[PDB]
Amino acid sequence: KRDEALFELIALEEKRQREGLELIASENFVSKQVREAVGSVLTNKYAEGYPGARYYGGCEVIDRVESLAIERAKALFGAAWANVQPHSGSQANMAVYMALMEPGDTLMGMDLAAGGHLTHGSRVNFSGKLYKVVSYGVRPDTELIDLEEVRRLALEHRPKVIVAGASAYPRFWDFKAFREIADEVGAYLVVDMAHFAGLVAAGLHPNPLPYAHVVTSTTHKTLRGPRGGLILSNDPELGKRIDKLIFPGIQGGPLEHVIAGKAVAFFEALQPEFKEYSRLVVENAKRLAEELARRGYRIVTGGTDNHLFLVDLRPKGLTGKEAEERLDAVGITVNKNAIPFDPKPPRVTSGIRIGTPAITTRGFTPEEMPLVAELIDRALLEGPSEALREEVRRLALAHPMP
Amino acid sequence: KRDEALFELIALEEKRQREGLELIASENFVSKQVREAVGSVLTNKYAEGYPGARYYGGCEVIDRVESLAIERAKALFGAAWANVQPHSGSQANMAVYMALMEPGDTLMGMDLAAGGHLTHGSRVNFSGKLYKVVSYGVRPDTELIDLEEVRRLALEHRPKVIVAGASAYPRFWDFKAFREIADEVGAYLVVDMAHFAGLVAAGLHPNPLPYAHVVTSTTHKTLRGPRGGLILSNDPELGKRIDKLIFPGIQGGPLEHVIAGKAVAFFEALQPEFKEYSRLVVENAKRLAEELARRGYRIVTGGTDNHLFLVDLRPKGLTGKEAEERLDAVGITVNKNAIPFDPKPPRVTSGIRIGTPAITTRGFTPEEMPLVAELIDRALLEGPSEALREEVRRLALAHPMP
C-alpha cells in the first residue's frame, strides 16, 4: 500500500518551496540528479570502513563511488586528503575535535552572538560541554573581527584548537593571520567553511586549505549538495588520524547513497556554470543589502563580501522573532539572528539573517533585488496581508525550481 | 550536465544487488516509496528544533511530517515518547549516553567478541573513550548470557548505565531480569534493539519498552526502513532531556527527507503484511540453520529465536575468513564472526553470521532454504567455480527486488 498521507505532505512542501521566497542563508535547492543519487539503492549496503578496507564484502562498486567523491573533493578544493562520510557538518566538527583534543582541553571559537556556530563552543552543545571554551567576537564600532584581540586571547589562554569560520559573519577571513596566531601558541587551526564552501570552490572566497591544519564543511548550503558533511586537509598523516575518529570513533555505517550525491554535487561544482552561479549569489546579496539600506535598514558591517548579511532591527522597534513571523506570514522565510552585542536574549534577538543562495538557483538576478527589498520592507512596516502574500507568490512562481 | 560516471556506477551496484544472495544479517532492501521520500525536496529545509519550536521559519509542513513519524513510532512500538532525528544508530546511542552519564562514568555492555556492538564499550569507539567500560559475555558451556555473571559484575562495578542488546546474539533477551539488576545497583537500563526492532514491531520478539528506561534503534535492518536512528521510551520526562542532547547537543539540522522515509517505513510496519514478512524471516533463519546442521555444521546455541544465527565451521576445518572469501566469490555475502571462546584470533575466527531478512524481502520461503544451504556447502567445500556462480545468479534473478 502507498502511504498516501505522507506523499500528500511532500507535495505540500514542494508547493511551499515553489510559492515562496526562501531567504534563509543556509538553504539552497538541490538538482534533480543529486536527488536521484540520494534516493538510490546504495542505501542497501553496509560499508563500514573505507575503500579497499571494509569490514564486509560486496563493496567493490561502493568503493568506487566513495573514492570518486573523495578524489573530486580533493581536486575541487586542492586538498591532499578528504573524508566524505560525515553525516553532517556537526559530525564533521565532532570528529576533528576528538582527534586533536582530549576532554578538558581549551578550544577557541567565535562567540555565538558575534556570528559563531553552535559547534564553536556553545555550553548546550557538545563543544562547550567536553571542552573549556574561549570566545572572540567583533569590534563594537566596525563589527569586524580584530586580529589583535584574537591574538591576545590566544596568548593569554593558549588554546589547543582555534576555530575560524562562522554561520553569520558577512566578511572575508584572513586565514594566513589566523594560522600565524595559532603558530604563536602551538595550536591547530581548524577552519569550518560550511557556509562559504561554495564560494571557495568558485574562487570567490579566500581558500583556507593552505593555512588551516584541517577544514570541515557541510556538503549542502553554498556548495549546493546533499545534506551531509565533509573534512579536508593538506596533511594526509593528520587525515589518517581523523579517518579513525569518523569510523570506528563516532559513526557506524556511512550513508553511501548520500555520498553518491556528494560526488554528483562536486561534479556540478567543477562545471564553469557553478562559478557563474556563485558570482550571482554575491551580486544578489550586495545589491539586496544595498536596496534595504536605502530604505533605512541598518546592515551589520555596512554590507557583505559573501552570500549573507544581517539586518539590525533595533531602530525599527522590531525583535528578530517578530520580523521572522511577519515575513513568514507572507511566504518570505528568513531566521531571526542575534547581532553583535545584542541586548535581547537568543530566543528573541534583535535582527534577522538573509541569504541569496536559494533564490539565485531559481534564477533571480540583481535587477530583481529592488522588488524583493520592497516586499520585505512592506511586510515589516505594514504587517501581513493577503494582497502582499499574493504578490510574493506571483514573483516566486515566475521563477522555476530545479 | 549529467554525471554519467557516477550514474554508471549506480547501475552496476543495482546489478550486483540483483544477481547475488545477501546473507549479511544487518542488510535489507527498502521499498520504492521509502526511496522516493528520501530523494524528495525535504532535504532543502533547515529545521533545527522540534515541531512547534523551530529555529527557522517555513517549517509548517515539515512539522507535520516529523509529528507523523513520531506518532506512528509510538503506536507501532507502544511508546510514550520518540525522537526521530538521530542520523544513525550510533548517534542515537551517543545522545542517550551523554544525557545519562558524564565522562568518566561506568558503562556496562556486551563484549564485542561475544556479540556486542562497537557502541557498547569498544576502546576505539567513543563509548570506550569517554567512559570506563565493563563487559559481559556468554558462557563457554551454554553459549548464552549468564544473568548471574551480569549481576555479579553490576554489583562489583556499579555502572551508571547497563546496555542490553547486541549485533550477533541469536536468542531472546530477558529484559525484566536486566531491569531488576539495574534497579539493584541504581543504574539506567538502555536497550539497543537495532537488530531485532522489526521483530519487536511484529510482536515476534519480547518488547523492551516497559522494562528499559530508554530504547534506541536503527530504522534500517529488520525494520526495513531508511538508514538512520530512533529513540523511544515510556518516560516523557526522560525523553525531554534526551531531545536536548540530540539538538542542540550533538546534531545540527535534521535530515527531514530521511524522517519522511522513516514515517513511510513505520506505515509499512503497521500493516498486517509486515507481520507475515517477519514471521517468514524467522522461519527462514530456523530452517536454514537446520539445513546447514544437517549438512555437517554446528549452530551456536543449537539454533535461533530471531533473524540471524552463527555457524561453527570447526566441523569442516574452515575459518570464518576463508568461508567469507569463498562465498563472496560466488555471489554470497556473509561475514565472519567469532564463536564463544574462539580458538582463533578475531581477524580469522571459526564462524560466520547469517541472516535472512534480505532474501525474505526478495520472496525466499522456507521450502527454498534447503537449496540455499546446498549452495553454501558446495562453495565452502568445492570452492568457487563459474558454474556455481551462475547457479547463484539465476536463483537470485528468479527472486525480484522491491
UniProtKB/Swiss-Prot annotation, chains A, B:
It holds the Pfam family SHMT. (6S)-5,6,7,8-tetrahydrofolate binds at L112, G116, H117, L118, E237. Pathway: One-carbon metabolism; tetrahydrofolate interconversion; Amino-acid biosynthesis; glycine biosynthesis; glycine from L-serine: step 1/1. GO terms for molecular function: glycine hydroxymethyltransferase activity; pyridoxal phosphate binding. The keyword Ion transport does not apply. Its main location: cytoplasm. Pyridoxal 5'-phosphate binds at Y46, G89, S90, S167, H195, H220, G253. One of its GO terms (biological process) is tetrahydrofolate interconversion. It is an enzyme of class 2 (transferase). The keyword Nuclease does not apply. It catalyses: (6R)-5,10-methylene-5,6,7,8-tetrahydrofolate + glycine + H2O = (6S)-5,6,7,8-tetrahydrofolate + L-serine. Its EC number is 2.1.2.1. It comes from the Bacteria. PROSITE patterns: SHMT. One of its GO terms (cellular component) is cytosol. Gene3D superfamilies: Aspartate Aminotransferase, domain 1 (3.90.1150.10), Type I PLP-dependent aspartate aminotransferase-like (Major domain) (3.40.640.10). Its cofactor is pyridoxal 5'-phosphate. Keywords: Amino-acid biosynthesis, Cytoplasm, One-carbon metabolism, Pyridoxal phosphate, Transferase. The record marks H220 as: Plays an important role in substrate specificity. It is found in: Cytoplasm. The modification N6-(pyridoxal phosphate)lysine is found at K221. Catalyzes the reversible interconversion of serine and glycine with tetrahydrofolate (THF) serving as the one-carbon carrier. This reaction serves as the major source of one-carbon groups required for the biosynthesis of purines, thymidylate, methionine, and other important biomolecules. Also exhibits THF-independent aldolase activity toward beta-hydroxyamino acids, producing glycine and aldehydes, via a retro-aldol mechanism. Homodimer. Belongs to the SHMT family. This is Serine hydroxymethyltransferase. It comes from Thermus thermophilus (strain ATCC 27634 / DSM 579 / HB8).
